[PDB]
Amino acid sequence: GSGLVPRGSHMMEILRGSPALSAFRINKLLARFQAANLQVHNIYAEYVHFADLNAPLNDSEQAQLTRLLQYGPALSSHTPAGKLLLVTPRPGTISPWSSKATDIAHNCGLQQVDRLERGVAYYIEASTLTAEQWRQVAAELHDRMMETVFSSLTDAEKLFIHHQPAPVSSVDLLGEGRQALIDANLRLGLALAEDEIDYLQEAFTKLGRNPNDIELYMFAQANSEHCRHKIFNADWIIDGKPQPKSLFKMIKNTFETTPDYVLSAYKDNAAVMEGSAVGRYFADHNTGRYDFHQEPAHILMKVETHNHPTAISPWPGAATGSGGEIRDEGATGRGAKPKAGLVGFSVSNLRIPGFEQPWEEDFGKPERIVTALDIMTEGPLGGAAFNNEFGRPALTGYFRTYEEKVNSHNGEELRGYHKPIMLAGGIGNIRADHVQKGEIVVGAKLIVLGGPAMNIGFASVQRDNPEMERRCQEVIDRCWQLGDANPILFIHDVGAGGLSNAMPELVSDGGRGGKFELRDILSDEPGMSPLEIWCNESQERYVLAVAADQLPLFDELCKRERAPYAVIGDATEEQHLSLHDNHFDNQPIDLPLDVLLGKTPKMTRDVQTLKAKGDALNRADITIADAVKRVLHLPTVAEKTFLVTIGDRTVTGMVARDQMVGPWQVPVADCAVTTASLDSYYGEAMSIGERAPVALLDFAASARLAVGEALTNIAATQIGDIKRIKLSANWMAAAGHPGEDAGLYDAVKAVGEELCPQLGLTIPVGKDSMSMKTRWQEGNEQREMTSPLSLVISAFARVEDVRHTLTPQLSTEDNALLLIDLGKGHNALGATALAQVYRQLGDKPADVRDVAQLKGFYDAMQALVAARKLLAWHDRSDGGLLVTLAEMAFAGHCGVQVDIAALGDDHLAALFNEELGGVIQVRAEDRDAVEALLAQYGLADCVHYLGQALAGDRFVITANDQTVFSESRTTLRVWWAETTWQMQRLRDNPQCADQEHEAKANDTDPGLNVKLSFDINEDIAAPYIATGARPKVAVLREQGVNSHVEMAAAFHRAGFDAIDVHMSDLLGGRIGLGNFHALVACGGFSYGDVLGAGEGWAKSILFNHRVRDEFETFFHRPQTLALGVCNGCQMMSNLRELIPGSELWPRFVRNHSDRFEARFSLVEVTQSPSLLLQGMVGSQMPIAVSHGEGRVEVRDDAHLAALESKGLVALRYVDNFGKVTETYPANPNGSPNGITAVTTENGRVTIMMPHPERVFRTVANSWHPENWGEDSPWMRIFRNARKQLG
């Protein structure tokens, strides 16, 4: 029986949940305790749930609540023993878990539930221990930045305290003079300049009234160098000479020179370029049916960083970095649709315990920040949690480690990334007449779309709820999908400054003022002051203007999606900002907009050039063999799987090229490619170029190389005209650090005024983060860790044919490998991975050697791509030619025999320079034609025949008759894997990490391979489609689901009319299942998987008796068909009681890896009654997997044997040898007997974890046999459905 006690005006129920930690996590905790000399005999942990009730539950409601709070894997339950430590969110905070779980309760009719929260009760047996050591135990069990530890369950009442609203406070300028502003500036941490203090003093003396804190806070944000970009708008004097252009004007030079294809630059959040005219697939507002709409899909692009918050709390830092950038995309124009993401990290040395590398030295860090290791453990998980749960695939990225004492521009000092680069970006699509924002009508309603606010903007500890952002995106999508009737007049993301930035910017951009009502804004924290409500940086919010007459439409759209919103003001003709408070009947803000948005003078930066003298590499301890080993262990170079498979790469159904390449799924793809629509071969490409360490020797060369590498990474994609490629430039520097300012100017000039104009590359978007350094006291000594100037270039392009992309996967057919050395034999070793791993900086770095030749290289690559003359491509970058060739051999699972005698006598420099260029593989018969073709672009003396790819395990580098380097390719491949192995091992289930790593050492692995039991080109649905009779399918979705459009598209290809059926449609009677003969429950993250993946969705059905009866009725009809995929499989497994023949079905629980798995996994189709798998039994082919809770769990061995004997298993993971497996990641989730689909006795209902709808197009299979046509094997599931309905 659960606890129930008074809690102010309410009652608080305390419910016991389930064991919270798996055995390996328990063992990890005990080992941490042993290692810190805390003698802990045992530890057990249990979730506990807290429900704050505004009215009582009856017996039935109580049983409902209890059932809602049963979820999770069925771990070993124990009777509590020893000391209780309860870990909860900090008082004053509300977990994302709380927001989601409380929505579930409400959708199951539990309106009495005011709020649910969760904690973890730890039961620690350690009968020794002093209270000092108890605080040390407690420290180990919580995150000090977001959680607190309590000694009683009943202390959870403090989480639900309701504080009375705090009033506005004035700053008494009139009563104290300027000192009041000075006091306020220090108290509120506004960081105002003297001349800003002067401006505010005058403005308010002029008005004759004291400013409120809220008005000062608002002004401080809107004027900080960041929001105002003072450095990038500054006048410069350098070495005594005035400069004619600001940094911004130099970036704009690129648009002045190359306007081509650009639709929007510097006037929104995202830049927009031309895309392709394609069939855009979405559900019509009138019919609810999914239809193709032939129109241009233009391409938006944006890249942002979130550096300081990630240094403090990396998980939410990364997660909200992604969340904010996703909102910028969605709020482009009058609404747009994010499509795919990219991710970047730069951090200091990892210093992985037990795997220290020889270049690494502990220099200490500030106590207030986390280590590089914690950033790379938790940060990628945060960014991926946002991308996965929002539903955008993350398809390209970079990850660099740098921390060294070097003799740079300011002499000998510590250079690194204690404050990291945390970068998030992406592309999206946007309609032609939404690229422009409108012109705000007077009396327009001004709306906040999204989450109830809390006091968030401890103040750098963010909080993310991606499911809220998904619900808002669905609204925005409905809006732009109305074309000319889109009701969004203007929209803007809410980010830095909260509403205090966003709403003034919304009305300003529309030439208007606003008047606002504070008490209309949705709030989860009644205590907040007007300052906190107006200025907090609570996440997942947008602001928009809608005409009064469209408000009923907007309301309907929001309610169907379950996206909260509030009309909070009206647009005024008068250009005044008014905020009123109905509670305190006063006016926290009453200001003309010109007063608020008032510029002090522009900055002048008067600076001088510092320039390091290089020092030639000391080679005394370097051999080629040792160097190969060290370089492959540099995380920058090394295999990146830990950053890739944690993130979904198939959501949308438009991913053509992800990071993982070939049958061996090696993450070496140089760029990302998406299709433009679900029915096109046109597309979009993304690449990244960065080379920060070079800036320690040469600022301008580091920038030129960033541009160059973005181009070399994208070059083997079919684009055509170089002017199609558009760049984002993100500039990270320690402004004011000696030499960095002049270097910044010179780098911006090097790209903006020189290289990009000459190549024809526009930079229509960009950002800057200008305090990339960290200071702290280490001994009695001041310490400082300062970043190199760090330009990250992201390149975006329209793609002419996604099928023609090349990867690094070498063929072993008769071939030639040719190096294109754009370094022209300079072979520079300064600031290379080679230099870094021997703790040096070296002498001269690479650089763009010849602009015409770089353009020539691009053009020549485009010609070879279009003529189908390349077998493979991989560019040269970190780790040089050696790494390029090794990675190609990894991807090809083969050997190379190369000769480097033509590349100079210095073999080390030939192999390890990081000059621009790369290796092309061509058919041996095409070698002379390819060489002549390259010669036509001026490249002859840069092109060198190296040798060939050969079947086998030999990686061999010769120079004439001398062996320069020779090793097992497998050995090198395993060395290169060691960093990801060790990361996975400390972050995930070490048993899984080890299994994955060990499989890499088996050269006999034949890679993904197929066996087909049917003809995959035979359209068995074609006779039905040809009659023109198209049966409906209910494509079912719930709040937070994300993969509903591609599911519809698969069914549509098989001849169905796909209907968009939200659970809100079933609940409002707008749709009835009695009108359908087929249903599908789609994937994604309903309710964010809170209360167990699929459970909230299922239980919202089961606890609403009418909708429940409707499902049951559907499933009991004699000819109805249903499919559940991923989240829908989870949902339907929780709905067993309504589905006949489902008694032996398992549950689907947390993966054994304890990690989200985004894999392209090999399965076989097994013999079952499943009607959707007819004709496919015995087939083996890969399929998209994307889930965290896919592990089949049975109630005991009896139930496993019964399920098996009944013959209801329909798909099983196999290894690449074709055998059923439980070894990871071949089986990605630990399901017994590889089980990942089941059917009912009648075969009419089938549920599966993988996503056949994501891979029905051959072009969307990460790897596939060359001879396939447009249809993959998985198309047959949807065709089988059509045919069965007859």
Ligand SMILES: Nc1ncnc2c1ncn2[C@@H]1O[C@H](COP(=O)(O)OP(=O)(O)O)[C@@H](O)[C@H]1O
């Ligand atoms: N932070 C990351 N998140 C996702 N993928 C990443 C990340 N860092 C690198 N990758 C991917 O891993 C592969 C190897 O990356 P890297 O060796 O840095 O690329 P390159 O040397 O071609 O620039 C690429 O496909 C790249 O997109």
Ligand SMILES: [Cl-]
């Ligand atoms: Cl027990």
Ligand SMILES: [Cl-]
């Ligand atoms: Cl095959």
Ligand SMILES: [Cl-]
């Ligand atoms: Cl009802």
Ligand SMILES: [Mg+2]
């Ligand atoms: Mg690389």
Ligand SMILES: [Mg+2]
């Ligand atoms: Mg590359």
Ligand SMILES: [Mg+2]
């Ligand atoms: Mg790179």
